[PDB]
Amino acid sequence: GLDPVKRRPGMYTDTARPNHLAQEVIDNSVDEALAGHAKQIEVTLYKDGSCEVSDDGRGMPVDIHPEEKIPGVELILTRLHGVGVSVVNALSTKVELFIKREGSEHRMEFRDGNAASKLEVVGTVGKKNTGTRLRFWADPKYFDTPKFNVRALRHLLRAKAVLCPGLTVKLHDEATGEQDSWYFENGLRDYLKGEMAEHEMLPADLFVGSLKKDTEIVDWAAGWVPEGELVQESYVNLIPTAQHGTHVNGLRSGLTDALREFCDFRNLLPRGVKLAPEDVWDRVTFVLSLKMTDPQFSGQTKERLSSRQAAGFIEGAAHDAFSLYLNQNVEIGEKIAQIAIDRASAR
Ligand SMILES: CO[C@@H]1[C@@H](OC(N)=O)[C@@H](O)[C@H](Oc2ccc3c(O)c(NC(=O)c4ccc(O)c(CC=C(C)C)c4)c(=O)oc3c2C)OC1(C)C
C-alpha cells in the first residue's frame, strides 16, 4: 500500500520540493542506460508544475501478473536513493505513462496513487521503437513548494551523461523555454577536459585510468593545474559524494606513492625535501566514479564514503596505473613532480 507514504512523505522523499521525485524517475531511466538499453533521456518541466521523463529503453513490461491479475506496471506504481517510482505516484495527484514495447504504444493513468485506467493499447510503432515516458503532477499539499530547483536538476542531469558515456540527456523548461543537452562520448575525460579548457594542465589531456575487479569498478580523470579553480567530483554508484571520502583518499594515496617513487628514481627531490600527500593533491583537478556493492556512508549527512575496502582498491589501481604512465611520459611526469616539489620546497 501507498498510505504509509502519504502519512509520512518526509520519510520517503525530500518534501522541500519535487526535485527528489524527479530524481527517482530519472534514476529508473538511467538504469536502462547503464544496462546498455537506453541512449537518450529527456526531462521536461511544465508550466502546470508537472515533470516528465522520457527514455528510449526497453520500456516497462506490458504484461499481466498471473496472480495479481493486474498489469505489472500497476503493481510497480502502487506497491534518499532507490525508494521506487511508487513514491512518486503516491505523492502525485496524477501520473500518466506511455510505454513503447513489442511494436505497440501503451498508456496508463493514475490518480492520487490509484489506477485511473487500464493498460491501453493506444498506438502501433516499429519493432525498434521502444521506451518509457512518465509524467507526474506532484500534489502541492505535500511540499513546501511545487516549484523545481532547475539549477540543481541541471547539475544532476549532466552528471548522468558524465557517468554514463554515450548517453544523451536533455532538459526542457517550459516556463522559460530554455533547453539543455549533455553528451560525453568518453564520459569522465571529455567532461573534465571541457570544464578545464580555460586552464593549462598536466597532462594536457589529463591522466585517465580504470580498473574492474568483478564487483568493484573504478574510473577517474585527473590533472595538475598550476593556476585556476579546480573541479573535484567523486561518486559512488552514481551517487555524488560532496564530502568525498575513502575512495578519494585511495586515489590521492595511490597517485602520491607513484609520484614519490618517481621522484626517488629520477632523483628530483631537493636537499631535505620530501613530498607530502597535500603537496601532490593541492593542485589536482579530478572526477572519480566508483561502483561497489552496498557502500557505507559517513558524515553528518552521509555525503562521504566510509567503505575502507574502496580505499585499498582504488589506491592499488591509481598506484599501478600512474607509475606506468609516469615511466612512459618522463617530461610530463617531471613537470607534474615539480608542481608538487614546489609546494614541498615552499615550506
Ligand atoms: C519504473 O520501471 C523501471 C524501469 O524504468 C524505466 N524508465 O525504464 C527500469 O528502471 C527497469 O526496467 C526493467 C527491468 C528489468 C527488465 C527485464 O528483466 C526484462 N526482461 C524480461 O524478460 C521480462 C519480461 C516481462 C516481465 O514481466 C519481466 C518481469 C518484470 C520486471 C523484472 C520488472 C521481465 C525486460 O524486458 O525489461 C526490463 C525493464 C524495462 O526497472 C523498472 C521496471 C523497475
Q: What is the CATH number of the domain that holds 27?
A: 3.30.565.10
**Residue 64 DSSP symbol:** B
Residues with Cβ within 8 Å of residue 276, at least 6 apart in sequence: 344
Do 277 and 172 belong to one domain? no
Contact indicator for 164, 33 with CB cutoff of 8 Å:
yes
Same structural domain, 182 and 196? no
Could you tell me if 111 and 220 lie in one domain?
Answer: no
106 labelled binding-site residue: no
Residue whose Cα lies nearest atom 32 of ligand 1: it is 61
Instruction: Give the residues surrounding ligand 1 with Cβ less than 6 Å away.
Output: 28-29, 31-32, 55, 57-61, 63, 72, 76, 85, 132
Do 315 and 346 have their domain in common? Answer: yes
| HEC string for 278-331 | HHHHCCEEEEEEEECCCCCEECCCCCEECCHHHHHHHHHHHHHHHHHHHHHCHH
Residues 152 and 13 in one domain: yes
- Nearest residue (CA) to ligand 1, atom 5: 28
140-to-22, 48, 136 alpha-carbon distances in Å: 14, 12, 12
CA distances from 150 to 23, 43, 143 (A): 12, 11, 16
Euclidean distance between CA atoms 217 and 313, whole angstroms: 9
Could you tell me if 36 and 165 lie in one domain?
yes
> Does the annotation flag 82 for ligand binding?
yes
CATH number at residue 292: 3.30.230.10
**Do 50 and 178 form a contact (C-beta atoms < 8 A)?**
no
By residue range, what is the domain housing residue 71? 1-186
Ligand 1 centroid to 27 CA: how many Å?
Answer: 13
Alpha carbon 304 to chain centroid, angstroms: 15
Helices and strands, number each (H, E), in the chain? 10, 16
CA 255 to ligand 1 center in whole angstroms: 40
Exp. method = X-ray
Give all strands (DSSP E) within the chain, no chain letters.
40-45, 51-55, 92-101, 104-111, 114-115, 120-124, 131-138, 168-173, 179-182, 202-213, 216-224, 232-236, 239-240, 284-291, 297-298, 304-305
Instruction: Clarify whether residues 227 and 305 are in a common domain.
Output: yes
134 and 42 belong to one structural domain: yes
- What is the domain count for the chain? 2
Residue 39 marked ligand-binding: no
Residue with cell 548522468: 160
- CA distance between the termini of the chain: 63
Q: Quick one: 39 and 149 in the same domain? A: yes
Residue 155 CB neighbour total at 10 angstroms: 11
Instruction: Mark whether 172 and 230 lie in a shared domain.
Output: no
Q: Is the domain of 300 the same as that of 195?
A: yes
Which residue's C-alpha comes closest to atom 3 of ligand 1?
28
User: In angstroms, rounded to a whole number, what is the distance separating the alpha carbons of residues 344 and 347?
Assistant: 6
